Design a protein around this ligand. Structure first.
Ligand code: HEM
Lengths: 498, 498, 498, 498
């Protein structure tokens, strides 16, 4: 306490005098321009909001730990996955389409964004609750997300727009099937699996390469809500998932996931009968079984949601030695996009905020800019230099690379032996779902098509029949009778929609 | 169509070639850095979101017309209110606390933001659906809004925080009573009244001054939802109000409001038994009756929600000759705050966007800055100048002013004869509400207090007993039995809250 | 060093691999999109620049110490000025009109911006190298600065614009005389005086008030350059002053200034024969003599110019207990303007950057926003609260206030007995300047008028004759003969100017 | 004029009342918070400055016209270069290293940024006044520019840093030779040549490809200043080039350049004895002669420098059909970097500002964002769509592409038969320069090395001897005697430098 303290300060540390009354000319007079405490507090209030994420605006998370319990050193040299290693983590969960204040229990994909604070940098595995996605080229991603959001005139979400996009981009079928099935509505984030989705590259100490898939299997099981239940919860508690996570950890109920990988030898990646670089494809566990790595535990709530969760900036570009990207076009687009969005959303120095700083020493050739908190003193700004300030200069083929040859083109990826748009979705509907799940699926899909413009409905019937003739007929019959579930978060029809 | 057209362009107008596939080295190869269409489209996608309004993030609106049907020329010289004048309008409706994607049917205040595109500038009457507010000094406003939003650790709304603030700021009682009563949940925006809330100054052609209140009385009546109904709708259709407005106008059902004023002679403003400059007070219609002015009709939907509604920037500083502010401290704070927030939210040149431009010629001493669309050529940048570029230089007392005298102070406004924190709220509960409304009010308030930390509940009981001894006891009895309604948008208790 | 280190890292702390070659498909192939090190480094490079200050863009500074050597406790309770106190300082010097890369030796005002890192907050005394300024109302300031900068079409500085403004605002005469005299061209920043210019309020422990002027008298003396010398230096070394300061401190030659105040009793401020609240007036040292306080020494160079000097954010609003503002309209405008500019220039959290943080604990009701480095955990966001998080709530007249009474008006300040626009300037020319200084002054002013549009020249002759009939005739005679010095930084005439 | 007009307005179009006095409580009282005209004007003034370009901050330009006078339709299908076509242009000239207010006559590269407003989009040819550059990989560019700017502690330019960079990157020799020769100091922008520097791709109507170099040969000749003359001018008139251009056009003296290309058949690009994709190499005019295209005339000054020149945003990504990029790594980096910098410098909608809009219709899949002036109404936001809103979907090899094959690598480009770092520079010194130019060159280079740290000087002597043994010895001898010219804009040595 200072001699003239009053209970709080202005931004310069001087006593604020009052947090409750403005500076006026007498009790009845106007406010004066030089009420600097009023000005500082209001000008800051007016700049509290930052642009929400696009997509995945609505979310929350927690800190935890990852422990390696198996030996996978033969597949990677990454320090984080070496035998016995324990690493601090941060995980943010999210929906995709909805904005900052939208209900948690809308039918949607969920994000599973995981950071490992490793000894050789921050390693971000930015996943979802599905092993696949709707698209295989990033040029389509902007269109997709806009189709999932709002009409330009009325500002409403619209199933007609969603189905127009999906039916005109049949590569979407595998993921749309997954979304419309039971897993479109997780009961809690604790009761859903996480996946890397993409094929990544692992490189071992000898330079040998494997293509890898990541699977985070919940120790709490996979539990889902019905459309009706999720709708009810959306009204009663729009932050049901956020609350559940925080309360579970606060009570000492720490959720866990076991990490497994699939590991494909380098050369087999080029010849496998499904394209591992096609994000719409899963890789059969019969061909490439899951191999255990270790266990993820979440055990610590944030102390400040905005500083630690909202301001967190995850990026697939945040690889570490031993782990690389792959020829998956969607992943390569992501390598650019996140960092770019974060410069706008948070700032040029987003990676100097405590939650985004690595544990190891950063020695990076970047200087100046707004809000530069940790400056580099008189370090040289150029390389090579004669001043003893180090730089990197490895030449030749990179350890996390691969080969390419061809002419510059814009075209679809070449099909492997068993690649198509509909086969894997079919397999899901026919072989994986139970009878009860198929019944629910029909009611969901028919519901999602209710009120959809007729020409778009007609294309949807052909789309679903391509997935499976029987399910597609069942959906068609129900839509023609105007039956089906209400879908939390979206509807179609009426004068304010297409 | 150009000779080499492909169906769409890049930002420079050159053909885009593809909106569907990225530029790769062969079909199987990586994406190249020089896919400039991928880069432009993604970099723009990443900068689509802007900071949401704080407060009043969730909203929508429509264009319309205001017609003057009475003669109020004796009270004001403002062109917009002269006999027979018809003026184009824009109205945005909103909630207060919730973010961009939050349900429309939460219990809350609603915004009623009205712009008139007058011949002498844009006149903004930025109102609410209540004639009063919770506070009488703008220093408290930042605290209030933060109390209505989320806890810093868990990110949840919390009734304990809301009641802690309200019970420690008893000036809030009049508005908290209004909010907890029937009008806290409008059925539609068409079925709610709008109010200026503040006293404004009107000045006539001779310089005579009146203090005025604005009242917009819905021709559709005032209709409200129950807590249970609003909760159900929040789940089923989070954009119920936005949809209702758009569909009603699209069908030709144009909602109307009649404008009335109360007009207090200048000197009587200083002596009236309730303080007209205290935003927590209504002015009795027995003392100062409502006088009709004209009728507001909404008749045209936006063609682009984001450009015309989200990017609209309303401000109480946007007065026109004949209409001024008043010694209401809250209004004086608002004169600064909106324009300031909009510089951050939209940009320095927010008032050059079409929706925010006036109809008349702007000749303003402001130049340069980012995104300066309409430049001033070689116009002089300073005054006086010898180049024939005009400026303003009226000296002496302004026509929309008043007197003040005193020492610089931070203290509460002096009480008029009948000013207090609780009397008007009481009158509402005892005399205005029906028996059924009182019964509902008890269930609402008791519900809002369920799970609230006990020390804060105890202060709430004293607060409600100060409003009315009988209602306060009824609330206390119900809270002690753990009864009451669920309140859409908020709750208390549990490990993630206070 | 990590096991896989390469000499530098990316922003996530992972090895960068190369700071010298991009990632390509073979040696001859294109750059791939996923060269994330290329992207991070370029995207940061592209965001290194921040808006330059307006005005005072060109500058540099150093750290030092202020030691109180006299007892002025009877005039102020401010901790920084209590007997024997030593306080760390930061001082930035600057010109006014020129941009970031403009020569240091243009004829101009110099800034003298001094921060004291006190035990009760950062106290900023943001002065100039003159005791007066050109204007007495902040509405004119924007116009003035724009007149000192560039024409809207050609982008050139123009003496015609400068004189058009000055001659149409005769309040400018006192400062224009000072600027055109010897002190318009300091040889070094070490060899110029600094001044607070404005009257400030000092309040002692008993609540007694004095109006104060600050004077920083250089121990190195006041030494100036001729127009010809300054022009030569502008070509040979555009950073002459910046270099001089850095080299002098590096060699151990620490420049010093002694601080003196003038102290006017509170009531005498209202009756003195020159208006102490008029920034165009000096206060006679015969009436109110200088009183010594202590000594300022600069002794430490920055380690990083951009982080410590460019990103420094000084503000007259940064008062501390014992020191307040005054009824000087220009000072009251400054209380708002600096903080506002800094939110745009640097960011919302400009006062969390190390150079701008106070030494004492900040407990301020501001939360969230972009680049929030030092978060407040779970501290309450509202007041009063029941959670033990303190706030301020002092009521009544503030200790650094004063009285006012009147109607809202826009008009000139009332004249004291001896106030006018020209008298003090005259006194300077007639009584203070030597014969040689008068001769130089004539050559400077005539030079500054060379090529000026004839109608503006004619008004300038009347202006100078009002200052002093003899000097004004001498200037007129020289201008009519087209004689006079070239003025570093500006000229008039020709097809690209007025 | 409106009935209540006062000579100017606020931003909402209402009369401003005064541009000269603030709103106070009586003449002697404080300024009130609700002086909204003071607030608007100051808040805008505070946001007038935008980040300067990095690099090429200091510049100016003019509009003009390009006329095709020859038939080059066999080489390109680009509309802009078809027989007889006349196209409106905008050209911005600039230096590179210096900031916004830095003198025009520093020794430096000059920018030559040319936009053609074509019928098929804006085509930007963003050149320099040299056919080569210092570097051949964009990873080095950030380092280079930072080396040309200021030391991190003192904020001074430093020749030691410049030479440390250049001598450690010997690829720089060709361009450093050009810069240190006569053409480092153009007398005017009218008296310098412009060059595209890079190889670009031209594609004709049949799909046949040629690699092209652009050369803009001044009809005013090439005229240069001495170091001493340029230094003198830097002091006397820091805006000498800006003024010269504006005055010449104003007087009707319209500067012209003739455009010539070199055209290399596609296959010969891969085998030519100098690498056409190496920006440090010129292509011999004996092997590939210059072919005339047409003439560029500048004939119209800007009406607003800031809106039309400062806010102009040029980009090499702004190609048009018939013109593509090439495998030059530096060009490929530029395709990303400009647009990125402009999003920060100006805004997301930089290409909606009038100067940056194309003449033809833009139909681009980008929506929303700050300051969106020209919205897209209810146009579909996704593709394909069933709503009649067109998109692009060309599949297969692009017309402006080429082939690549290899593994992902970071390494130097493979050498052609006659590629090295020093040979072309030599040829310049030995064969192109006259005796007098060689004498001047020695004095320039020796001057540039004066005061440079001895170890860096020693490396510079080896560097210059590699260019030419005789010139290198002459430079060494002069440096060891401490002789040489002063170089405008830079020096070395002393306590504030390396
Ligand atoms: C990889 C190498 C280069 C990179 C990354 C690069 C980057 C940039 C950037 C970011 C700007 C500022 C753009 C803006 O803010 O509007 C710029 C300006 C400029 N650059 Fe480049 N540059 C490179 C090489 C070159 C070369 C080789 C040339 C000439 C052939 C050139 C000519 C120019 C010109 C003339 C400007 C100023 C344009 C104007 O007047 O607005 N640059 N450069």
């Amino acid at each position: 306490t200072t001699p003239h303290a009053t209970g709080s300060t202005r931004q310069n540390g001087a006593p604020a005098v009052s947090d409750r009354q403005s500076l006026t000319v007498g009790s009845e007079g106007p406010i004066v321009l030089h009420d600097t405490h009023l000005l500082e507090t209001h000008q800051h209030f007016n700049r509290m909001n930052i642009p929400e994420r696009r997509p995945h605006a609505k979310g929350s998370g927690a800190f935890g730990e990852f422990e390696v319990t198996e030996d996978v050193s033969k597949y990677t040299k990454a320090l984080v996955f070496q035998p016995g290693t324990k690493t601090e983590t941060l995980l943010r969960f999210s929906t995709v389409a909805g904005e900052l204040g939208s209900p948690d229990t809308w039918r949607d994909v969920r994000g599973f964004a995981l950071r490992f604070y490793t000894e050789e940098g921050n390693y971000d595995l930015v996943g979802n609750n599905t092993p696949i996605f709707f698209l295989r080229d990033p040029m389509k991603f902007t269109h997709f997300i806009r189709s999932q959001k709002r009409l330009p005139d009325s500002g409403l979400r619209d199933a007609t727009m969603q189905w127009d996009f999906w039916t005109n981009n049949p590569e979407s079928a595998h993921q749309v099937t997954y979304l419309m099935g039971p897993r479109g509505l997780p009961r809690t984030w604790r009761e859903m699996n996480g996946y890397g989705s993409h094929t990544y590259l692992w490189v071992n100490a000898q330079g040998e390469k494997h293509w890898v898939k990541y699977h985070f299997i919940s120790q709490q099981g996979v539990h889902n809500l019905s459309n009706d239940e999720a709708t009810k919860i959306a009204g009663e508690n729009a932050d049901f998932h956020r609350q559940d996570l925080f309360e579970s950890i606060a009570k000492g109920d720490h959720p866990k996931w076991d990490l497994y990988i699939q590991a494909i030898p380098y050369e087999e990646g080029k010849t496998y009968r499904f394209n591992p670089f096609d994000l719409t494809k899963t890789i059969s566990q019969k061909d490439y079984p899951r191999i255990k790595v270790g266990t993820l535990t979440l055990n610590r709530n944030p102390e400040n949601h905005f500083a630690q969760i909202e301001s967190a900036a995850f990026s697939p570009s945040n690889t570490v030695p031993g782990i690389g990207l792959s020829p998956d076009r969607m992943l390569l687009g992501r390598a650019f996009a996140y960092h770019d969005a974060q410069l706008y959303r948070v700032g040029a120095h987003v990676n100097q905020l405590p939650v985004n700083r690595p544990k190891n020493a950063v020695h990076n050739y970047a200087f100046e800019g707004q809000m530069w908190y940790d400056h580099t003193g008189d370090r040289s700004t150029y390389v090579p230099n004669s001043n003893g300030d180090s730089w990197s200069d490895e030449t030749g083929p990179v350890d996390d690379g691969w080969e390419a040859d061809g002419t510059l083109t814009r075209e679809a990826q070449a099909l492997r032996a068993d690649d198509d748009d509909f086969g894997q979705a079919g397999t899901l509907v026919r072989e994986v779902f139970s009878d009860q799940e198929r019944d629910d699926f029909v009611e969901t899909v028919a519901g999602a098509l209710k009120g959809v413009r007729q020409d778009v409905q007609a294309r949807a019937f052909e789309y679903w029949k391509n997935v499976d003739a029987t399910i597609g007929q069942r959906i068609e019959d129900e839509v023609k009778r105007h039956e089906g579930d209400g879908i939390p978060g979206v509807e179609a029809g009426g004068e304010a929609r297409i």
